[PDB]
Amino acid sequence: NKTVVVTTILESPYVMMKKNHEMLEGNERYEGYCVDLAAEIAKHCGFKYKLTIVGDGKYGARDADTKIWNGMVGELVYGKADIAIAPLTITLVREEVIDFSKPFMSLGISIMIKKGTPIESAEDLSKQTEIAYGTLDSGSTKEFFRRSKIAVFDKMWTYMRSAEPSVFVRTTAEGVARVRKSKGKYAYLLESTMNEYIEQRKPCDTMKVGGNLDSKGYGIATPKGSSLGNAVNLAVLKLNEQGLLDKLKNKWWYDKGECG
Amino acid sequence: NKTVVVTTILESPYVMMKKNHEMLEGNERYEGYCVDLAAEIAKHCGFKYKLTIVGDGKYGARDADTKIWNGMVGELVYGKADIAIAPLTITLVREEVIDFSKPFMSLGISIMIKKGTPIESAEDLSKQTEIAYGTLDSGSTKEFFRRSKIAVFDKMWTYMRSAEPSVFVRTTAEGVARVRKSKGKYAYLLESTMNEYIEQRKPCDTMKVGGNLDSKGYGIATPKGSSLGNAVNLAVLKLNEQGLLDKLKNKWWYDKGECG
Ligand SMILES: N[C@@H](Cn1cc(F)c(=O)[nH]c1=O)C(=O)O
Ligand SMILES: N[C@@H](Cn1cc(F)c(=O)[nH]c1=O)C(=O)O
């Protein structure tokens, strides 16, 4: 057997650099939900692995011109990594080029506001212009709006794509910082999982409002045809049935929440 | 190509006999969420199909002695059906013998009470003996309790397995009838999806209480190695992304709710 190369992404609380990572090496440098999940998956599948952070820091999109896949999806497609264990959304376009395990976490697009912002829904956002709003500049959330045929979401996309200055951000942390520093004049559309995590982090000035706009899941990905796919899929189901996934979410989201 | 034999189960509001089914034939005899889903899946995969109701009316379990699979899972395993489109829970033991598409619906085990019953959680149920409680006599809900290592659920299982008279029911309708006629002395543990549906049906005397005990999903199943598996999986993802699955749930659960 050969050491399995795992690609993942620095996104809290899935994968984060330990405070004393400098005095550590290898897999011990990282911590988080996906770090713990990788260990469990490897144990149940019987393989040794090496955690690596995706080179370009992206999730995975295909350039329409070059037809090249970037991010974690690209690392799997081109053979740079053997498996991706991260908050990677299971989508049709990705499923066509890589394999996904059954979902290990459920989520949906949601709204994050600075406390006090007079917004309760996506409809509210679409009907006004005072408060700007956007999404991560790349990823399944942005694609949801770009492709949506639903009236409200179509209206939101039409506004966001031409908004000036840009309402799109490079990372979740940037979106959160923008919400926190815009005095309620910026609302952020992001995956509910990240939203829920941030709501329990100091300075406790943000909140998730309304229901989710959609429902989907994160899955563990492997190059299509990979001999690891079957075992990884069964391991995810086993971990869910044993309640381990629920335990891990509580560990990284709520057990040490900072907002009471 | 050959007509695809679809196996499903009579479970409201997934598959139900039309009021005037007697004057109809073939697939037109049935209606419901899964009937509509089957039509969408068939359209997107390009196949003609025949809806059939599982012979033994079961979901799918393996007899420990004969090693024989019953229910819809069995029909796929033994080649009696080509695909199962129903509220079939994706589980490890089943995934080992048949293939499952990514989930088309999310759910979790939940508690159904007759309005007014002094119960708010699974913990509440486990700490008392006045109110009896049980599950469907076979299926993923019962297995959840039988296998759970979680204190509260283990305590509940220990009670349910030896309770007299039996707290297990043959069908969802039986569990609901038992809740409605037991004057609050019987609480029913069932999948949240069914619970949510019943709560919006007359006589509007039941209610879902507390959060779900777990989180999982329903998937479309095919015999392992089936040439239909890949297309069906992509179709589920496409239908979810296009918002069709959400539309179908609203259609069969809430659009015509009978409880205001
Ligand atoms: N999980 C997404 C990436 N991703 C992450 C986020 F935190 C978010 O808010 N939106 C998003 O699309 C993907 O796989 O593209
Ligand atoms: N979906 C389950 C069957 N099933 C159905 C129910 F309505 C319920 O409450 N519990 C259950 O296990 C399976 O696939 O076994």
* Domains parsed from chain B with CATH numbers: 2-107+217-256 (3.40.190.10), 108-216 (3.40.190.10)
Determine the Cα–Cα distance for residues A35 and A248; give it in Å rounded to an integer.
Answer: 10
Residue to substitute in A90, A104, A136 for testing ligand 1 pocket (most ligand atoms within 8 angstroms of CB)? A136
Chain A interface residues facing chain B, Cβ-Cβ under 8 Å?
90-92, 95-96, 100, 102-103, 106, 144, 147-150, 214-217, 219, 233-234, 237-238, 240-243, 246
Other C-beta atoms within 10 Å of A96: how many? Answer: 12
The interaxial angle of helices A229-241 and A33-45, nearest 10 deg, is: 110
Mutate to test the interface with B, among A109, A237, A239 (most CBs of B within 10 A): A237
Task: For residue B94, say whether it is annotated as part of any ligand binding site.
Answer: yes
How far does residue B85's CA lie from ligand 1's centre (Å)?
Answer: 30
Task: For residue B101, say whether it is annotated as part of any ligand binding site.
Answer: no
| H-run or E-run covering B186 | strand B186-191
A236 to chain B: closest CA residue = B92
Chain A nearest-CA distance from B214, in A, is 8
- What radius of gyration, in Å, describes the C-alpha atoms of chain B? 19
Q: Which residues of A182-213 are buried (b: 16+ CB within 10 A; e: fewer)?
A: eeeebbbbbbbbbbbbbbbbeeebbbbbeebb
Within 13 A of B241's CA, how many CA atoms are on the CB side?
22
Contacts of A92 by beta carbon, 8 Å cutoff, 6+ apart: B234, B237, B238, B241
- What radius of gyration, in Å, describes the C-alpha atoms of chain A? 19
B100 to chain A: closest CA residue = A102
What single-letter DSSP state applies at residue B31? E
Which approach determined this entry?
Answer: X-ray
Stated in angstroms to one decimal place, the resolution of this structure is 1.4
User: What phi-psi label fits residue A204: left (phi over 0), alpha (psi between -120 and 50 degrees) or beta?
Assistant: left
Closest Cβ opposite residue A240 in set B216, B234, B243: B216
* Inter-chain touch A234–B96, beta carbons under 8 Å: yes
Compute CA distances A11 → A175, B22, B107, B200, B239, whole Å.
Answer: 13, 57, 27, 40, 29
Breaks (C-N over 2.5 A) in chain A follow: none
* Inter-chain touch A147–B217, beta carbons under 8 Å: no
Instruction: Give B148's contacts in chain A (Cβ within 8 Å).
Output: 243
- The closest alpha carbon to A52, from A13, A19, A3, belongs to A3
Contact A71, A56 (CB under 8 A): yes
User: What phi-psi label fits residue A26: left (phi over 0), alpha (psi between -120 and 50 degrees) or beta?
Assistant: left
Cis peptide leading into residue A87 (ω within 30°)? no
One-letter amino acid identity for B247? K
Contact B198, B176 (CB under 8 A): yes
